[PDB]
Design an enzyme around this catalytic site. Sequence first.
Site, short mmCIF file in Angstrom:
data_model
loop_
_atom_site.label_atom_id
_atom_site.label_comp_id
_atom_site.label_asym_id
_atom_site.label_seq_id
_atom_site.Cartn_x
_atom_site.Cartn_y
_atom_site.Cartn_z
N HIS A 183 0.76 -1.78 -0.07
CA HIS A 183 0.39 0.29 -0.19
C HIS A 183 0.48 1.39 0.25
O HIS A 183 0.03 2.59 -0.24
CB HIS A 183 -0.65 0.88 1.42
CG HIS A 183 -0.96 0.45 2.69
ND1 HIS A 183 -0.42 -1.10 3.02
CD2 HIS A 183 -0.18 1.34 3.69
CE1 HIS A 183 -0.16 -0.54 4.50
NE2 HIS A 183 -0.42 1.46 4.24
N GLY A 212 1.31 4.47 14.95
CA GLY A 212 1.51 5.36 14.27
C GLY A 212 2.95 4.74 13.19
O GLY A 212 3.49 5.49 12.87
N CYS A 254 4.13 1.78 10.44
CA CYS A 254 3.99 0.73 9.47
C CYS A 254 4.97 -0.56 8.70
O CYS A 254 5.89 0.22 8.77
CB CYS A 254 2.77 1.12 8.49
SG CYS A 254 2.32 0.18 7.01
#
Length: 306
Positions: free
Chosen positions: A41, A143, A145
Amino acid sequence: SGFRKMAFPSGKVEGCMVQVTCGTTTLNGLWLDDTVYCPRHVICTAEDMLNPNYEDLLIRKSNHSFLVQAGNVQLRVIGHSMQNCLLRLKVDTSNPKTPKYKFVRIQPGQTFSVLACYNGSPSGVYQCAMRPNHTIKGSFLNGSCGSVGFNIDYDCVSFCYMHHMELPTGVHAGTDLEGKFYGPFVDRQTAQAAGTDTTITLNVLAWLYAAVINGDRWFLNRFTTTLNDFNLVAMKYNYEPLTQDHVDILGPLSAQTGIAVLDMCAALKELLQNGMNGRTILGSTILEDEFTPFDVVAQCSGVTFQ
């Protein structure tokens, strides 16, 4: 104050952490030999996330579309492909400290260590456990990834998880290192949090014991409750029902503090029915369910035997 999880060994995984940027998005990635793995993503714009056709979005990218950084070092991208929900990037040099490793897919109940990253810099290794709904609790994952999960056996690191997103229910979803999601989750913007907000009772009880070991006492009362009566209250408040097996799991903590499990349940019952009224427990104004009995025993019980 606040409960602090015990630090676990990193197995040199910190040396394998890099960052990948595409467009205006930057997330963490894993660098092994001359390959970097990260959530696909990263290629999506805010708008793309609403209904992304990843194959179509990727043909709009080239190797130069990706910036891979290992600290103040650039790893030039020389190849890219998509594998399930991961982006696999080939770079122009190999990780000089690639550990012996394997990729495995784990199941609910099994624990693994996660190397948390803050603003892309490794910030600690903590133990996590996948819940039956395939999500994991861990405020340190917030917060962030792209961080990874793993287990170490002798000299081999078995990577089993990569973080893809935080759901609004405060739990996290991810994939294995082949890019397949654990659970029904998908990498697009959608309402996929159903069944992830039930509070983990065993963890809340464990944390209350942690608070007692730390010195908190205000929430304790001289009352008690049967398991059924407790569960009636738990269910009404969308907490997992407590089983005799869970009661058994809390034995060590109950023995350490001298507080019977059903008595602690009586304290929890009152906290759910009346609230904390602005009072704190272990530096929190809400009941915490991210710490397991094992997390608590690891930091608050000294040495635990097998």
